[PDB]
Amino acid sequence: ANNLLNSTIPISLRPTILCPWFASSEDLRLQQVMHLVNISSNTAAALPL
Amino acid sequence: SAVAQCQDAGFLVPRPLDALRQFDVTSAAAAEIMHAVNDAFKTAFDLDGALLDGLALYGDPRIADLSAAYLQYGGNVVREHVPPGPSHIHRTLQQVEST
Amino acid sequence: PFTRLVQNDVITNVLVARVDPAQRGDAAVDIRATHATFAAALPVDPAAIV
Amino acid sequence: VEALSTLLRSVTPLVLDPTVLTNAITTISESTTQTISPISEILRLLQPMG
Amino acid sequence: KTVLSRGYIDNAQFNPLALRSNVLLMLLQFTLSNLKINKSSTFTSDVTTI
Amino acid sequence: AGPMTSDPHSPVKVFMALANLLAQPEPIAIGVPGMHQTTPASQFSHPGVW
Amino acid sequence: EYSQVPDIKDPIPPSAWTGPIGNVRYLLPSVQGPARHLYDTWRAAARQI
Amino acid sequence: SGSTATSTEHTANNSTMMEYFLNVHAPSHVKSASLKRILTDMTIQRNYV
Amino acid sequence: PPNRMVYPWPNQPLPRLTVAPTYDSAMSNWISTTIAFFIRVVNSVNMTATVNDLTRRTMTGVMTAMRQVKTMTPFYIQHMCPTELSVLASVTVTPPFQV
Amino acid sequence: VAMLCGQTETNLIPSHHYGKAFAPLFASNAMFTRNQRAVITREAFVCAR
């Protein structure tokens, strides 16, 4: 958010949390390319974006 | 990996099962294998949208590889490559095959 | 990249390839002959922009 | 020529199917009143000849 | 009989020439079917003689 | 409205738009043969025709 | 007047449609001919709308 | 088709089929070379209403 | 000469149907070079009178798509068709007539 | 079109397919009748000349 909506967390024990929510850029780069492969390269692809 | 192993020395993958016979290596077989894998993943993880599709658009997964580039009127090219990162399941599968 | 008035730097094509050209032996060929091309354009109106 | 051609078609393992070709092309073209003359020949090509 | 078998071999047969592919695909399903987490459960002491 | 668009050829199109109106009193040279100062400005869509 | 129904000399085969979207079916890309032309034209106009 | 509100749909389909006939079906099917020569270079926007 | 037949294309024995013979055939070379040539044709400066940028890319995309799609026809011509012609000529009632 | 769409079958064994397809071709006797007719042609030609 470009440092807008600054927020922070409390400071206490969080024993058993797990948040598998992330990936490397290569994953993102790969997915982006894959996304570009599964479209008709005419205007039909661009317009929704 | 799966498509390569059915081929003879395709890409640069390990081949633990190479002792087993595999006569047909036609592009049709490769497409069928890729569809099988694509369906398997969609089932296992309950995916919804298109996944791994479009690679068979030209109908020969045996040489499937991703790359992007743009060209300038001066004749210069960029030719950016997009290789996959390291994977866990792939390494796991090798142990299964070896076992 | 946004090029500006540099004739030699005008980007004519954005390309993507589904297969490795080296396997096909296309290693020495024009890039346009080996990669797919995007083609989409939107006809905006100057009056609204102004 | 006719007899030989019939024999060849009856004996070869080759299969002619313009499916993948149509799919690939249709990802680019569209049969609309605009951009029809540029692609008219392509439509003639892909027309089912029987 | 995952692949290369359906319309080609009898129900009672198996395709000896496509063995490596079918074996590989079977192992793949084996792998996917086990992608889980070994969650814990209730432990108790044993008060019996055993 | 020229700069607001992403088309690389927009500056030339802008320049030729005025050049069309001034073809009578103020002539200039057009490089590639077959193109004249009264050619519709929107046709200048190639880096080699600047 | 209303007892007339048109006679089509080459009906669209049932295998030319995709799976249903609740009521409608999209046209397979592999299908060509005048129907394809009609489909694209209306689709393009729908996009503009 | 009780009033002018129907003219739009029928006129649209009318134009579409005619255009496909002129540009695709007829050249692929007609025999006279002279007819092909004159049938080409013809479009609805300046040859049909 | 007797027991001989001429052929417009080069011919070779039937190899394993792997990737390399799929794309190395002379006919495939003819197709690849030809489409490559027409691509720089349509992109030539002279086409500007009709071909705007959008059309230029559109035509380019069509040609490259035609070039990329897999086809076994060239392989069949170079490695399988001569076999079929050879056997058929031995049984047709009218022997081949060639120059 | 034929040059560009060259699909092949899935389980293609050239030896099996060719042998299966060529076997009926040798059930004919036209090959021999051809020879006989040619021989008669020769004798007819020589005597006529």
From Swiss-Prot, chain B:
What subcellular compartments does it reside in? Virion
What function is annotated for this protein?
A: Inner capsid protein that self-assembles to form an icosahedral capsid with a T=2 symmetry, which consists of 120 copies of VP2, with channels at each of its five-fold vertices. This capsid constitutes the innermost concentric layer of the viral mature particle.
The similarity comment for this entry is:
Belongs to the turreted BTV-fold inner capsid family.
Q: How does it assemble?
A: Homodecamer; each decamer is made up of two conformers of VP2, called VP2A and VP2B. 12 homodecamers assemble to form an icosahedral capsid. Interacts with VP6.
Q: What is this protein called?
A: Inner capsid protein VP3
Q: From which residue to which, out of the full length, is covered? A: 869 to 967 of 1214
Swiss-Prot record, chain H:
Subcellular compartments: Virion
What is known about what this protein does? RNA-directed RNA polymerase that is involved in transcription and genome replication. Following infection, it catalyzes the synthesis of fully conservative plus strands. After core assembly, which consists in recruitment of one capped plus-strand for each genomic segments and polymerase complexes, the polymerase switches mode and catalyzes the synthesis of complementary minus-strands.
Q: What is this protein called?
A: RNA-directed RNA polymerase VP2
Which gene does this sequence derive from? S2
Q: Name the family the entry cites.
A: Belongs to the reoviridae RNA-directed RNA polymerase family.
Q: Whose protein is this, by species?
A: Aquareovirus C (isolate Golden shiner/USA/GSRV/1977) (AQRV-C)
Q: Which domain of life is it from?
A: Viruses
